[PDB]
Structure formats: C-alpha cells, structure tokens
C-alpha cells in the first residue's frame, strides 16, 4: 500500500491580534446555543454563504428550503438567517479538545479596503475540519456529523460591531453517522 501524506495538527498562523481565536471561540459556541446572534456581529450585506453536501437531518432540510423560494445551496445576506434557522441543532466539542479539530489559518493580501483609504487590505483565511453531534427533535434523528467550514475574514465596514467581518462562509456537510 502506498502511504498517505503525513497528518499534522492544526496550523494556526493568524496575526498577533488573535482574531481567529476570538472569532472561532464565539462562532461554535453561538452556533450551538444562540445561532442567529452571529449575523449582526459578523455578517453584513455583502457576506455570502454556501452549504454543500459531499437519514441526514440537514439533507431533508436544505432540500425543502431550496425547492421553495452531493448537492449545493448558495445564498446572499438576505436569506442567511432563514437558512441557518433550518439547519440542525448542534453540539460541537470544546476547541481545547485540540485533537478533535483541524483548524488551519493564515493572513493573506489584497482584499479591498472598505474605507477606501488604501488600495488593499489583509484578509484572514480560516479552514476548519471537525465533527459535531447533530439532532433533529421532530424526526427523532440524532447523530455525528463530520464537516468542513471555510471562512474568509477581512476588515469590516465603518460602524460595524467588530473591526472584522465575514466575507465568505462555505460549509461542507459530508459524513453523517446515526447514533
């Protein structure tokens, strides 16, 4: 058997202000316990969100959502809340269970500067591979999800609650093991 590429732990290279930590600690806690509060904090009129697939509670949910006004679903800021409402209840492990998370991040150049004072702004790319417990109360469906989620963060618009915002949020829901 050929040998797969070696697997190392999370490679966290964010800038000194530790935004990746602050953001992700808030993100997964609120995703589980107070999900919609994330949007006013970090999402704005330009943020884009996709949920992709690689019985599944999320599958039936995104199906019905898409019919109404492996498979993909892309939305702008106008529908993010409504979609997030329909996504399964979750419990993620704590981020300090480090071996249960694969989080890779780095800062990168040449985003736009929303203040227009400079031609470029630095961005922060955060990619997460993790797992969570998913539940759908009505359909008595409970199980373990493996997922990927890629965030692009950048400077926020003037007046925003935080100095950074989410530009792009790409959720990939692959494996679902019933339990």
């Amino acid at each position: 058997s050929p040998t797969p590429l070696p697997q190392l732990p999370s490679n966290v290279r964010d800038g000194e202000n530790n935004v990746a930590s602050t953001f992700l600690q808030a993100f997964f806690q609120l995703w589980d316990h107070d999900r919609l509060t994330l949007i006013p904090q970090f999402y704005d009129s330009e943020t884009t969100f996709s949920v992709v697939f690689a019985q599944d509670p999320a599958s039936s949910s995104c199906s019905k959502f898409s019919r109404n006004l492996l498979q993909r679903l892309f939305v702008g800021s106008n529908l993010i809340a409504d979609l997030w409402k329909v996504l399964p209840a979750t419990r993620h492990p704590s981020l300090d269970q480090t071996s249960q998370w694969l989080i890779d991040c780095h800062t990168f150049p040449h985003l736009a500067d929303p203040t227009g004072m400079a031609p470029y702004a630095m961005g922060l790319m955060i990619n997460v591979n993790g797992q969570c417990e998913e539940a759908d109360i009505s359909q008595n469906l409970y199980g373990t999800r493996t997922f990927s989620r890629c965030f692009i963060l950048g400077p926020s618009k003037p007046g925003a609650p935080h100095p950074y915002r989410v530009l792009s949020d790409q959720l990939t829901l692959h494996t679902w093991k019933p339990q």
């Binding site: 800038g15 780095h106 800062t107 630095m122 400077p155």
Partner: peptide, 8 residues
Amino acid sequence: SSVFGAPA
C-alpha cells in the same frame, strides 16, 4: 492595512 495584526 490590517486588523489582524502581523503574523508571528
């Protein structure tokens, strides 16, 4: 310009 600080 950056809000993330310099990488270490």
